[PDB]
Amino acid sequence: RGILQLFGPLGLWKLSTFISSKLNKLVFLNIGFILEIIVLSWLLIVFKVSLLKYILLLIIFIIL
């Protein structure tokens, strides 16, 4: 009833609720929001590919 729930249903439910609540705030009809994300993605073309894992770490920081 302890660690196997934290690393199981109860723990993953809290993780899912936290992550899904973040994603629910990103779906709203707004021109400025989607334009910023489109233009931001252009940096993947500019950046050298070795920086992908740093962008991955930065994105996980923003989830918090």
Partner: peptide, 14 residues
């Protein structure tokens, strides 16, 4: 002056 290929031509050395 802003586009995916213009930024690549100006800021990316690839």
């Amino acid at each position: 002056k802003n586009s995916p290929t213009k930024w690549a031509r100006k800021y990316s050395s690839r």
